[model samples]
Target: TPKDQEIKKLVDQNFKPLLEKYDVPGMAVGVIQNNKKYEMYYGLQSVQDKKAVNSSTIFELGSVSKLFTATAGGYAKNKGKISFDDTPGKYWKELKNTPIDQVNLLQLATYTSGNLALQFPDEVKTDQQVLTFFKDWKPKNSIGEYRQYSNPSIGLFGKVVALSMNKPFDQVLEKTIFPALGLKHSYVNVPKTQMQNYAFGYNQENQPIRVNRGPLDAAPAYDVKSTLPDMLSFIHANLNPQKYPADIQRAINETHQGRYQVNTMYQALGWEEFSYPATLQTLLDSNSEQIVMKPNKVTAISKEPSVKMYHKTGSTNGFGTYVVFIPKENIGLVMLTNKRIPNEERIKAAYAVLNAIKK
Candidate 1:
């Protein structure tokens, strides 16, 4: 009872003001401590209709979807369908003999695929154009030389994984990955049956919007729509992989292994890692626009997985999401909102709540 009360107090103290300051229409927050789960929902799912958000509300996960893509890739690897050392040329013949083919799946998964742009070029709309873009593209830097946060990097990684499995990316995630992770309500494409529960994201101008379909057919980089409970299950799985099947547990654990170090942060598969008991400043620095918008040199590291704080931020035009978990402490946090807000505010709010929970 005291823990619940404390968590409620912390969520209210931190997120209520966050909603007001950002004019967020609705939000769902989930916190997990070992096997215990705590969730708090606030605001309206729609400003006009005044629908309240609940455990079943689906919010676009934006780039946070990369975690699913990464996990799918790992799962494929564990199932002997693919390997991180594989290249695009192996899956897509169009990329053969191109510079892009030289970048391996591991580099793509890690955002070190020679500086793929943050998104596919505007001219690349159709499947043919997407293939041509990659066939003609040149890497700005050598493979694994730098880390530049980009959707196309992981997007292609997911595409390759799908090819390896001989299935569509969304199908693989929906059928294999989500089911394995014990998520019932997460989806790459929200079906019509659940349309009513999907929250309309609001932009800065207070206009309703959602993620626009990108050139990536499956939109693996930023297309997941999920609920508080489903996301909590995901975070819980990440925190305790042993509770899952052997392949699923291995796939989840593989994502946490550090592949490259970018300054104070280690870039894992889809998540970023920092030393446990991470300070707010360190998190702020790691998630800053500079890190997202600029290419940073990275050092290759073969480090054993250990207890650390892992986090990822996702946002579309309308929604904002942040997920953080410290496996060592068996604590995880998920913040979801229908309105886009500044990343700094999200980090600060989450940091405050986590600090309180720790104390």
Candidate 2:
């Protein structure tokens, strides 16, 4: 209990400064250590309305939804319906006659498919247009060639997996994945029943805005909203997976398979892994702008293990989220905030608390 008290004191001492430093309206922190759970909520959920964030407050997870997408694909894979090496052409007949068919699931999930843009361009107006665009698009780098972090690539991956399952991506997540994982407060699309628990997010201008639905909005790589308790449960599952259903364990395991590398950061299905005892600077150094800008030139490494981490960061215009868990150490952390705080600050604050409490 001494460690719990120390962590609680750290939360009291450190979180207020983080709120000030990040100008966050409100945030929640959840930690799991050796099956013991700790939760903290701070600041106002709405700056204008001054609603305090609570255990049930839901926040948008942004791109961290990629992990959910990856896990969904993994579910399909475990069900014997999908393969990482299978090209899009294998699923969608529309792509069977095109070069896009050569783009495999692994590349899309790892952000190595080179042809897809970071976001859906304005020219892409409809779901049909998205299908047609990929059908006609040419790869700038060959499959497994570059890591260009984008929604379209992973979005299409989610779409293709849903097609394989004869369901909408969100529906699959809502009806199958979330339920299997025992997540009650997580949704690809937050339903009206849970709207009251949704935390209001603040733009840089300090104006309130919920997460915007971009093109390919139904894709599982974005648009997940979850409460602190639910997200922490997801983290706890990652920390101790053997207790879950066989499909969930398999799905989670599949997401941890590394497929690409950039700097010291190794890319898994939707997660990224690095050496344990990794410093903040090591992670900061890994996801630098140079790596993003010159992805094609980045060196790739083989045999990158996914044992300890599969953490990923997520952000929207109004919200920021980070989730990291160490299975070996039996530690996990989840931070959700109404402001899009810099990743550096998020990592620093989280690792500070995690490091202090890791023992």
Candidate 3:
């Protein structure tokens, strides 16, 4: 309970400067421990309005939605409703047309499905474009051959999960998951009554950007919005991680443990596979032989001091965010800023903040 009193001073001390330096208008932060939320909000919701962002002021949650999706998948697996080995065709007949039926949910969830990247082609520009893209898209490599961080892969996974349960993904998330956890501010589809609580999305020129993250077809995978307090609730569930019918929690924990040795790949049921060795490998021989997923040239930073971190970064045209925590040390962090920072810069900033969060 005192985690807040003990470390929050450090939180404000370490982070307040960055917020001021970056001119970040609003940020939702939480330091969850032992299944409780210790959270706070800083600054205004927007620079122009100077509206202070309250703990319950809803904000876009970006890719942190993936944790919800993965948790849902894990829940299904633990309940005997689904297995990672199940083929996509079993739920979504459309996927039968592509080679994806051969790829399992774990692969897709972890960004290893090799599903097309940026599934939008120049020729297509509408929702129909998305559907058409999926209609004929095939896996470029054998299932799980590589990880290419694509929303299409995970989005389709959510679609299948919803179809399998015979309900929209948002309904499942709202009725079953969020409600069970008492996360009232959480939403994939925010209710009309709470419109004012929802934060307005701002564009690059300080223009308010409207989001139509419609349709529960995209569930826990992405597009959910929540308040600062709700995210802190989420952080508790993930960092301390309970054994609430999710058999893969240990596996999810293992995502932070290095597995593939070649280039250093970590394993989780539906999470990021690490790109670097987190610690020095004192092994029997140099080439004990391992298979490490190579960092897709775009993310090759070798000398970075390694540590087992369970983290995810998310982005939309108008927002960027990250949610991550270290268990051994009992620190959880969530960040949201109104400046519309890119995924890369956000990661760098978040990493800097996290690295300094030592106990």
Ranking by lDDT: 1, 2, 3
Clash statistics: count for each candidate = 0, 0, 0
Task: Give each prediction's root-mean-square deviation over alpha carbons.
Answer: 1.4, 1.8, 6.3
- Candidate 2 segments exceeding 4 Å error: 298-301
Between candidates 2 and 3, name the one with more favorable lDDT: 2
Q: What is the lDDT of residue 121 in candidate 1?
A: 79
- Cα lDDT tens digits, model 2, 194-229, are 887788889878888987676674356678988888
Query: Which residue pairs clash within candidate 1?
Result: none
TM-score of each candidate structure, all chains considered together:
0.97, 0.95, 0.78
Q: Candidate 3 regions off by >4 Å?
A: 1-9, 33-36, 46-49, 122-131, 214-220, 243-262, 265-267, 273-308, 342-359
Window of ten residues with lowest summed lDDT in model 3? 283-292
List, residue by residue over 85-111, the lDDT tens digit for candidate 1: 888898977788899988999998888
- For each candidate, the alpha-carbon lDDT, in order, equals 0.88, 0.80, 0.60
lDDT by residue (tens digit), candidate 3, 1-359: 46556556656765566565655667766666555566767777755566788876788777667767766666566556667678777887765756667777766665566655633355654556656666666766555666565566677777766677677788767876676544788888788987777776666666766455543334555688888777776666556556433444542443343322224434354444443223213111111222212223122234433554556665554555677666665666777765556444444554555555445
